[model samples]
Target: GAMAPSYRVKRMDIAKNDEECVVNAANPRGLPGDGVCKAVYKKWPESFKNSATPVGTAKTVMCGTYPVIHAVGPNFSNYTESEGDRELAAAYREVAKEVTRLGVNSVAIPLLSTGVYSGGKDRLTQSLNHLFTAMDSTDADVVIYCRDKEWEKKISEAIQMRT
Candidate 1:
């Protein structure tokens, strides 16, 4: 089945996004580091403690005002391209599942593994495909955030071109 109309790609910063929950592409250790993870850590440091989110899975942390879903994506060095692709898809699915479990109607997500994880050159399009496919199974309104205008346009185009 095709993806529902609930997904949107926007040129927005996760720090300013007000979705009920935000999804962070996390490392297995679930420690706060670069990108959105560090910002999230600053906001709710306590919720991030004692956590270990394995690749292809996610866990929620209640941050009082909202919850943050830490989703672990495969690192390129640890897996083949195909394996990393599957893990990336699974990670997004896990996020959608967590959103349903938490009863949140909206979530903000990013292109997982495309950052410091060094997802391959096709990672952007592959991520859009996987994420859109995964979110089809959920009813939540999803906002896919990108830091730059170029990626924002690319993501929007990818979504629009989906079959």
Candidate 2:
């Protein structure tokens, strides 16, 4: 049952079964009680919480039973600019570092700055590239679970470029 490298992309979806780790491309404030947070909390209540700030590279808090990592900043609709993009990318790198620290082998992530934030595909792709490139040394498998086909295609293309 050896799968092709490209097949790994399809495996990023959130499954009904619990995951060891889950990633959200959201702002720190969005955690704790938002719709997405609630769903995750319901599934892994102990793993979700508001990430502590200055919100270093990757800020994170545990929901219920799973670990949640913040890979980007507030929504693109709320903040748009090179600075936001940089911070979001930095946050992703920070989160990835934490993922490494936690010894997780797999992770699930959402579209970092696309929704509510209105981040363009170009921006999202760049941020993701920055995040993954920095993780080259780790054995972790990153699962980016985008909310829509557009987001999925954007991230999928980014991953393809890396290979």
* TM-score of candidate 2 versus the correct structure, residues matched by position: 0.70
User: Whose lDDT is greatest here?
Assistant: 1
Tens-place lDDT per residue, model 1, 59-78, is 88777767888888888777
Error of 1 at 138 (Å): 0.9
Q: Tell me the tens digit of each residue's lDDT in model 2 across 33-122.
A: 443444555565554345545332565666544677655455555555766766666766777688777787676665455555544445
Clashes of each: 0, 20
The list of candidate 1 runs beyond 4 A from truth reads 1-5, 119-122
Candidate 1's displacement at residue 110, Å, is 1.0
What TM-score fits each model? 0.89, 0.70
Instruction: Tell me model 2's lDDT, rounded to 2 decimals.
Output: 0.57
- Residue 91 of model 1, lDDT score: 93
